[PDB]
Design a protein around this ligand. Sequence first.
Ligand SMILES: Cn1ncnc1[C@H]1c2n[nH]c(=O)c3cc(F)cc(c23)N[C@@H]1c1ccc(F)cc1
Length: 356
Amino acid sequence: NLYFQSMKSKLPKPVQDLIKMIFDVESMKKAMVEYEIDLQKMPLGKLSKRQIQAAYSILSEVQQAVSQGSSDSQILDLSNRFYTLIPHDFGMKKPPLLNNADSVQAKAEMLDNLLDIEVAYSLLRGGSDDSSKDPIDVNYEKLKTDIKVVDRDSEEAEIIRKYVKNTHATTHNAYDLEVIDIFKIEREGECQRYKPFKQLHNRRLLWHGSRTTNFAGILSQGLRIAPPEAPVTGYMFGKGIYFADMVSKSANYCHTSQGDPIGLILLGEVALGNMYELKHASHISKLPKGKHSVKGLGKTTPDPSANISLDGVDVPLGTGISSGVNDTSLLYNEYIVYDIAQVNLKYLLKLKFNFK
Ligand SMILES: Cn1ncnc1[C@H]1c2n[nH]c(=O)c3cc(F)cc(c23)N[C@@H]1c1ccc(F)cc1
């Protein structure tokens, strides 16, 4: 042409850092190490969906054996089959026999994380690996998600920072949160998928935290419901998509540590409709007619008189008050939907966790 075209990224610097953080191979590897996976038998590139599906089904059979009665033989078999799919490093300490709810639930949570890691990794290795363009921009494109920095002095940013400041507490005072960057995101196709559900009333802007190593999968594919193969163990309100109205609650699901103290949390617009309100666990197959979601009532709720609207989207950013709620085990509210299309992701926050 007339111009020299640099091989540098065409993205702004905070977006570049976001892409590097979510495609960080070192983090993928650390996760594998923490799970004690044998990395020579099962390297990052060897993880597959079919493998993960089959391992979930095994865990469901373990769960059925725990609730409905087991033999030693059966349990040993299921453990052997699980570890054949997800090989364990014998250089490390003996792996747990899968014969109890905690182990089942820890392994299911491993599989959720590994699935998103596999997604990230396959996106990363796929494509034209030619230098026709910057690696950062190529990996950005693969997310099929528009990501823009929200200007810090814009209305949106002031509202968002307020939602964070107010709904962060002195209870989970392990850390305070600091907003580093606010991104506006739009996943390809999601607005169209969401449209019909926009018709329902009670649309709310709610938090959803997750591990950083899951975000490539989250952005490329959107928030998902655990598959049918996955065990039900540990799903307080069954297999759906869970959100909080207090940033403190969602931030726990970032599983950030003093070692890596930055996490990512979403704000999504969720079409709740009529809410089935509950005070304790209850695994949900069907929902009562008239209801389109569940709300788990907590001891603490954002002050409803300090609530705001956006596009006719309720933003419950009031400071946390005692809900007055009688006989509940939940510290905080939760909201669950059972159809992936009831969610429209709007923002992604990068936060600093300042531990004490
Ligand atoms: C599995 N899952 N799917 C969507 N969200 C989630 C988790 C969770 N993710 N992110 C959140 O912010 C969150 C906010 C809550 F108030 C409550 C939540 C969550 N419970 C969820 C939970 C449930 C079962 C489980 F074995 C692990 C974690």
